Each structure stands twice: as structure tokens, then as C-alpha cells.
Design a binder for this molecule. Structure first.
Ligand SMILES: O=C(COc1ccccc1P(=O)(O)O)Nc1cccc(C(F)(F)F)c1
Ligand SMILES: O=C(COc1ccccc1P(=O)(O)O)Nc1cccc(C(F)(F)F)c1
Ligand SMILES: [Cl-]
Ligand SMILES: [Cl-]
Ligand SMILES: [Cl-]
Ligand SMILES: [Cl-]
Ligand SMILES: [Cl-]
Ligand SMILES: [Cl-]
Ligand SMILES: [Mg+2]
Ligand SMILES: [Mg+2]
Ligand SMILES: [Mg+2]
Ligand SMILES: [Mg+2]
Ligand SMILES: [Mg+2]
Ligand SMILES: [Mg+2]
Lengths: 228, 228
């Protein structure tokens, strides 16, 4: 549906939708922009990520509310409506995964872009995993793992330990280990090593970069406090 | 689209959507329930009102953000996107007005139901008026006025001055006068007379009714403080 709108107008409208807190519109504008076929700049990758994280965040919050109610119940209505919200969530995740596979990741050659998109691939498979069950759950969990691991391998080779994308990737992979993979020790080890290596590299940063890095290190510390 | 779902299941799902903060779903479930053709109970009228007030509230907030940006700007993109949000808002208002006209108001014979639906008719014409301009704006403003006035005439004849529906109707009609009709003196007179007549009737109320009434009287007092 956004095929007739200029790329620059889609990006401008994504920014207006963010100001208006219209995240579904923001995601549709950014999907339109990706579908123009050109690579995304750093600012535009962040617009894509903010749009979809807010849309899926709403769906995840609702799914948790409904799943809770359903668990306590255990007519068909709660299960039906939880399944409706679940399907809509799966559709948003599949859309994002589709944009990454067609063709954002394959054209991303710089570390900052390739790590960003692989982290996104891990996060959306992780959201699919939260609602998955059984073996289905296993192949989805391994997809999330694989994407996070490739991103980590690149980030460790190509970025300093304070780089915010590297820090956020490590934060979310630690969450994957604690909440999805039933590996709390791996989660704690990852968050602690990430935190310690960033602290040792802070002396290299300007005031503004220091603020960016320490904000995410505080997220790692908040989890380590929750987990220990 | 809700034609195949039982009325009771639509109401149950509206309540689940409210818990999940899924207001668009809640509005669609309640639209489905109205379209079954049966009158709505007090609880169900309140579900209808909560659903649509939250959906239109989101649209109004976005419209104000975009209109502000547009005013400061004065390419086509801001105007285009403000118009998109405006059209979607107008559509929600027209949907609500349609449900009231087909056939909620005509079947509503009790004061509590008829005043509730006429107040709703005033509020949704008032939302249309907020985005209207010119003469178009005049006929919409008079529709809102007419609906509020019929509700007020019934409420004054049939309900005590502390009745929360009567109080909320007077609150919103005062807002209509201050914000839409450019009649701040009528707004202040209405809110003050409403407040004073309710205060004089509080002695008749139980503890729980007193809490319900005084909550809305505090809203009248908050406006009177903003307006004087
Ligand atoms: O509360 C959180 C914390 O999650 C994270 C913490 C650190 C890093 C990454 C995440 P996330 O990608 O799981 O959102 N996420 C979240 C995000 C959106 C919605 C809900 C809800 F509780 F409502 F389901 C939870
Ligand atoms: O802040 C308000 C206060 O409005 C009222 C006050 C008393 C009685 C009725 C109303 P309302 O029916 O105009 O919402 N309404 C409102 C409701 C939703 C959204 C926005 C936004 F500022 F974001 F556009 C404003
Ligand atoms: Cl459903
Ligand atoms: Cl289905
Ligand atoms: Cl490449
Ligand atoms: Cl638009
Ligand atoms: Cl158009
Ligand atoms: Cl009647
Ligand atoms: Mg072009
Ligand atoms: Mg399912
Ligand atoms: Mg490239
Ligand atoms: Mg039936
Ligand atoms: Mg228009
Ligand atoms: Mg009747």
C-alpha cells in the first residue's frame, strides 16, 4: 500500500507518526521505506526498530494478560481471544523477519548495519519463541540463538566493547538465555562479562558517548540485580 | 465481521480486551454486540463508551500533535498525514453515531439509557466539531448542542442532581460550551449550578454513591478552577 509514496515522504511520515505515538502507522511507513529496496541509514534503522518494538510490545503485553487469565481458567472465549492476539503477534514478527530476509541482511556489509539487523532477527524469533510450544518452540529458539550468535561474533571482531549496538545485543542475548533458553548461568555470565569489558573501555569515550554506553550498562546491571 | 459470534461471547471478549488494553478490539466487539439488535444493559453501555472513548482519545491526541506541527510549518507530508488521521477519526465518530441512530436511541425509553446515548451523540458530534471548519463546523456544532440539550432536559426531569450520568453530561456540555461554542460564560454557569445542586443533594446518598458523585463533582471543580 505504500508503493506510490516517495521514500523520503515515508521516512518523514514515520517521524511524524512517532511524535503522534502512532506506532502501527510508523511501522507501515517504515515497511514501505524498506520495500523501496535501498539500504537504510543508521537513523532509518532506528526508526524501523522503534516502530516495530512498540507494535510488538503492545501485542506481547496483551498476550501476557490473556495467557494469565487463560491459565487461571484452566467456555472457549479466553483461548479464542488469546489465539487471535497470538496470531496477530506472529504476523508482525513474520513481517519483520521477512523484511530482514528480503533483503536487509544480505545487503548489509558494515558491522553497524549487519549486527543491528542480526540482533533484530534474534529479537523477533525470540518473540515468536515466547508464544511457541513443543518442538516448534525448539527450531524457533535455535533460529533466535543462531542470529544472536552471528551478531555477537561480528560485534566482538568489529566494534569496541562500549559500542551501544554491541551492548544492546549482549543485553538482549542475555535475556534470551535467561527467559527462553533456560540458561540463567549463561545469561549472568554474558551480562557480567559485557558490563566489565565496557567499564574498562569507558575512558576512551567523549561525554556524549559515555552517556549512551553507561545508559545500556545500567540495563545490564539492573538485570544482574534481578537475576542474582 | 462479528455477525457469527454469540452476543454473550462478544461482551465477554470486550471485557478481556479492556483488561488487555486492546481498545480497538474492545470497540469492534461492542459494535458487534450492538449490531445484534437487542438493547444494552447499564454494564454493556459502559463497555461501549469506554471502548470508543479510548479509541477516539488516541486519534484526538495524534490529531492535536499533527495539527500543531502543521500550524508551525505554515512539502505536503504533514498536511497529508494530519488528513489521514483526521479521516480515521471522522470514521470512528461516524461509526458511533451510526450505532446510536441504528437503533440505540430510538429504543431507549428509560432515562438512564436515553440520557447516556444522547450524551454520547453530543460527545461524538463534539469530536467531529474539533476537526471541522467553516459552515460545515456550524451544522456539526448544532448537532452536538441539540443532542446535549435533549439529554439535559430529560436528566433534569428524571434524575436526581447527583446522578453520575447527569453529572457527566453536564460536565461534557460545559466543555462543549467552553471549547467549541465559544461560550465560556455559559460553561462556567453550567458547571457552577451543576456543582451546587449536586452538593445540596449529597446528604441523600450512601457511602458508595457519595464517592461516585463527588468524583465527578471534583471534575467540575477542576474545570471551574481552569476557567476562572
Ligand atoms: O519488560 C520488558 C523487558 O524486556 C527486555 C529487557 C531488556 C532487554 C530486552 C527486553 P525485550 O526485547 O524482551 O523487550 N519487556 C517488555 C516489553 C513489552 C511488553 C512487555 C510486557 F510486560 F508488557 F509484556 C514487556
Ligand atoms: O484532556 C482531555 C479533557 O477532556 C474532557 C474533560 C472533561 C470532560 C470531557 C472531556 P473530553 O470528552 O473532551 O475527553 N481530553 C482529552 C482526551 C483524549 C485525548 C486528549 C488529547 F489531549 F490528547 F488530545 C484530550
Ligand atoms: Cl476472538
Ligand atoms: Cl480463527
Ligand atoms: Cl554485503
Ligand atoms: Cl499519509
Ligand atoms: Cl487520500
Ligand atoms: Cl422507546
Ligand atoms: Mg522516488
Ligand atoms: Mg496459536
Ligand atoms: Mg551494502
Ligand atoms: Mg445467539
Ligand atoms: Mg479533512
Ligand atoms: Mg426500550
Amino acid at each position: 500500500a505504500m508503493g506510490s509514496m516517495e521514500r523520503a515522504s515515508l521516512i518523514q511520515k514515520a517521524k511524524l507518526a512517532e511524535q503522534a505515538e502512532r506506532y502501527e502507522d510508523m511501522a507501515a511507513f517504515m515497511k514501505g521505506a524498506v520495500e523501496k529496496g535501498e539500504e537504510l541509514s543508521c537513523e532509518e534503522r532506528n526508526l524501523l526498530s522503534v516502530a516495530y518494538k512498540n507494535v510488538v510490545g503492545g501485542q506481547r503485553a496483551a498476550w501476557r494478560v490473556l495467557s494469565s487469565i487463560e491459565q487461571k481458567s484452566n467456555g472457549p472465549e479466553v483461548r479464542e481471544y488469546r489465539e487471535k492476539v497470538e496470531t496477530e503477534l506472529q504476523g508482525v514478527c513474520d513481517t519483520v523477519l521477512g523484511l530482514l530476509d528480503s533483503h536487509l541482511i544480505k545487503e548489509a556489509g558494515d558491522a553497524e548495519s549487519r549486527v543491528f539487523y542480526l540482533k533484530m532477527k534474534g529479537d523477533y524469533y525470540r518473540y515468536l519463541a515466547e508464544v511457541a510450544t513443543g518442538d516448534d518452540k525448539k527450531r524457533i529458539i535455535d533460529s533466535a540463538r543462531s542470529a544472536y550468535q552471528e551478531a555477537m561474533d561480528i560485534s566482538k571482531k568489529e566494534m569496541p566493547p562500549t559500542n551501544p549496538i554491541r551492548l544492546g545485543l549482549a543485553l538482549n542475548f542475555s535475556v534470551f538465555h535467561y527467559e527462553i533458553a533456560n540458561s540463567p548461568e549463561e545469561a549472568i555470565s554474558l551480562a557480567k562479562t559485557t558490563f566489565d569489558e565496557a567499564m574498562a573501555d569507558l575512558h576512551t569515550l567523549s561525554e556524549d558517548s559515555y552517556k549512551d554506553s553507561t545508559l545500556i550498562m545500567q540495563l545490564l546491571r539492573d538485570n544482574l540485580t534481578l537475576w542474582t
